[PDB]
Design an enzyme around this catalytic site. Structure first.
Site, PDB file in Angstrom:
ATOM      1  N   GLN A   1       0.807  -1.213   0.000  1.00  8.88           N
ATOM      2  CA  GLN A   1       0.000   0.000   0.000  1.00  8.88           C
ATOM      3  C   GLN A   1       0.843   1.266   0.000  1.00  8.88           C
ATOM      4  O   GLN A   1       0.286   2.353  -0.175  1.00  8.88           O
ATOM      5  CB  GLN A   1      -0.935   0.038   1.206  1.00  8.88           C
ATOM      6  CG  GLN A   1      -0.249   0.204   2.545  1.00  8.88           C
ATOM      7  CD  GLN A   1      -1.179  -0.202   3.684  1.00  8.88           C
ATOM      8  OE1 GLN A   1      -1.655  -1.344   3.745  1.00  8.88           O
ATOM      9  NE2 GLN A   1      -1.468   0.730   4.570  1.00  8.88           N
TER      10      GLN A   1
ATOM     11  N   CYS B   1      -5.083   0.444   3.920  1.00 14.42           N
ATOM     12  CA  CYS B   1      -5.203  -0.951   4.355  1.00 14.42           C
ATOM     13  C   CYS B   1      -6.635  -1.489   4.222  1.00 14.42           C
ATOM     14  O   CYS B   1      -6.820  -2.655   3.854  1.00 14.42           O
ATOM     15  CB  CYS B   1      -4.694  -1.126   5.767  1.00 14.42           C
ATOM     16  SG  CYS B   1      -5.557  -0.152   6.990  1.00 14.42           S
TER      17      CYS B   1
ATOM     18  N   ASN C   1      -0.360  -9.309   5.150  1.00 15.17           N
ATOM     19  CA  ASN C   1      -0.325  -7.864   5.352  1.00 15.17           C
ATOM     20  C   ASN C   1      -0.135  -7.199   3.988  1.00 15.17           C
ATOM     21  O   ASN C   1       0.135  -7.871   3.000  1.00 15.17           O
ATOM     22  CB  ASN C   1       0.782  -7.461   6.352  1.00 15.17           C
ATOM     23  CG  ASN C   1       0.492  -6.116   7.063  1.00 15.17           C
ATOM     24  OD1 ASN C   1      -0.455  -5.437   6.713  1.00 15.17           O
ATOM     25  ND2 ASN C   1       1.330  -5.729   8.043  1.00 15.17           N
TER      26      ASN C   1
END
Length: 243
Positions: free
Chosen positions: A38, A44, A206
């Site tokens: 990102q 996120c 993640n």
């Protein structure tokens, strides 16, 4: 737009299947797409929610789909682009906008201001609904429904994480969005006790690039039932549904 778990699980869990609660990792069962970054933008919420959908598509269609976070960042009026958002608000806008775009059609541009513009999307990729996952059903939801878009209370200790099992501090409050992709167990010998003991953990994708954590992922302690919630993971917990 939000379906109800007890309705959804009766549809997708083969009747009376027994859940193997020791280990199941979507990366070894075709449910996880490559890790993204990102970069310097608080998106996120998009990566988590959109990666969720990438994961449902992979599982239900046995085909690799890459979808566009930037579309949501630019277009989801119920969220704040790079200044944060909400998992359900993210799912609502995928539906109200008429679907995700391919990542190819609408590539990531991080925190560069960009007009919302769906006319650059050729094919569109829909979801029908999404479902909240109860706190005591994460392993069941994982195995039968798929990767789960989840909140997590991150802390500055996450900066240092590059694999293993995380034993840094947690955030005060839920503040970041990730994808729950699996669970595992390692039998660790204990030099003191001289007995083997079992160590259970959840596996999380993640969106900080493959150079963070374990190729992009983080392993967090849980227990046999998967009730233990390290870093308050899954306080918000949703799975998108294709039909």
């Amino acid at each position: 737009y939000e379906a109800n778990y007890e309705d959804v699980i009766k549809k997708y869990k083969p009747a009376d299947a027994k859940l193997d609660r020791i280990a199941y990792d979507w990366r070894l069962h075709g449910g996880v797409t490559p890790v993204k970054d990102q970069a310097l933008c608080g998106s996120c919420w998009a990566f988590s929610s959109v990666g969720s959908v990438e994961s449902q598509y992979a599982i239900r269609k046995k085909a690799l789909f890459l979808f566009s976070e930037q579309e949501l960042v630019d277009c989801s009026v119920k969220n704040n682009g790079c200044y944060g958002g909400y998992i359900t608000n993210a799912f609502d806008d995928m539906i109200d906008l008429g679907g995700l775009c391919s990542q190819d059609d609408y590539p990531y541009v991080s925190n560069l201001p960009e007009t919302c513009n769906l006319k650059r999307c050729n094919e569109r990729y829909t979801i029908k609904s999404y479902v909240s996952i109860p706190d005591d059903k994460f392993k069941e939801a994982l195995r039968y429904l798929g990767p789960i878009s989840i909140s997590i209370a991150a802390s500055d200790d996450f900066a240092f994480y590059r694999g293993g099992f995380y034993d840094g501090e947690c955030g005060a409050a839920p503040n970041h969005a990730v994808i729950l992709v699996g669970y595992g167990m390692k039998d660790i010998y204990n030099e003191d006790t001289g007995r083997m003991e079992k160590f259970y953990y959840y596996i999380i994708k993640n969106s900080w690039g493959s150079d963070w954590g374990e190729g992009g992922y983080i392993n967090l302690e849980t227990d046999e039932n998967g009730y233990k919630k390290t870093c308050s993971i899954g306080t918000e917990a949703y799975v998108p549904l294709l039909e």
